[PDB]
Structure 1
Amino acid sequence: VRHMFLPFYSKERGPPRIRMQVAGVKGKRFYKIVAANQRDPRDGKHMEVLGSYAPCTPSGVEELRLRFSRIKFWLAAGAAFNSKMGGLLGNAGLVPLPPPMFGWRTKARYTLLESVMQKQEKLRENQLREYFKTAEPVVYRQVKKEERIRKILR
């Protein structure tokens, strides 16, 4: 350990780590991304607040707030982290992307599924263009009798 980061290492508690403290209230839970020592209480002692992570949000998209310079600084200092934090940092671009659970080599069925899904998306785009050529907001289609159908394009 370089002399600068010695205070970040605790004889009683362990080395520094980048981890998440539970936050919020019963039911509504998010996480505070902090730098702490290994044996500190999860929601207790820590050294710095590096960001927050909310998987469930009203916008429907997981939200990740991070101090990029501070994450770089703590990685340089040598803070350790687990698989989930490594994956979040890889998605954020702060660190290279860690391998998936069983490794990259083991994913071929999933690549085939991705290719099939892309092909179906292109087919639906072509169908949507064909629809655009007419663009009838309301249509009538048979059951006995004809019922009204609204062609909403969400």
Structure 2
Amino acid sequence: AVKIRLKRMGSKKKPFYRIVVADSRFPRDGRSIETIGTYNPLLDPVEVKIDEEATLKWMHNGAKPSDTVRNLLSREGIMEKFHNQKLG
């Protein structure tokens, strides 16, 4: 089951996450299908950059955001679009 999740990279006690699409089976920092965006939690206003087009393409093919990703996509505001394109 392919799902979108964070990927930890950076230095010791300085994490930086890169939103990727990959299977659950593959390692956390291993194979991935493609990359969507990044996520910096250290910045006090957390800044995130997303494709907003590859995500919606993937979520109509059987992709599920994880716990932290869903908060990111909701705050950015594309799960509304996933709502509207589903029923419309």
Identity of aligned residues (%): 32
Q: TM-score, with normalisation over the residues of structure 1?
A: 0.50
Which structure has more relative contact order (CA 8 Å, sep 6+)? It is 2
Instruction: Could you list the structure 1 runs, at least 4 aligned residues long, displaced by more than 3 angstroms after superposition.
Output: none
SS across alignment from 1:33: strand
Instruction: Report matched runs for 1:42-61 at 5 Å.
Output: 42-57=28-43, 60-61=44-45
Find the aligned partners of 2:5 and 2:78 in 1 and give their Cα distance: 15
Corresponding residue to 1:67 among 46, 51, 59: 51
Deviation at 1:52, TM superposition (A): 0.5
In structure 2, stretches of 5+ residues that fail to align are: 81-88
1:33 aligns with 2:16: no
Deviation at 1:69, TM superposition (A): 0.5
Q: TM-score, with normalisation over the residues of structure 2?
A: 0.84
SS across alignment from 1:77: coil
Query: 1:84 corresponds to which residue?
Result: 68
Find the aligned partners of 1:82 and 1:21 in 2 and give their Cα distance: 12
In structure 1, stretches of 5+ residues that fail to align are: 1-14, 97-154
Find the aligned partners of 2:35 and 2:73 in 1 and give their Cα distance: 15
Find the aligned partners of 1:23 and 1:83 in 2 and give their Cα distance: 19
Please tell me the root mean square deviation across aligned C-alpha atoms, in Å.
1.1
Find the aligned partners of 2:45 and 2:65 in 1 and give their Cα distance: 24
Aligned residues: 80
Matched AA of 2:51: R
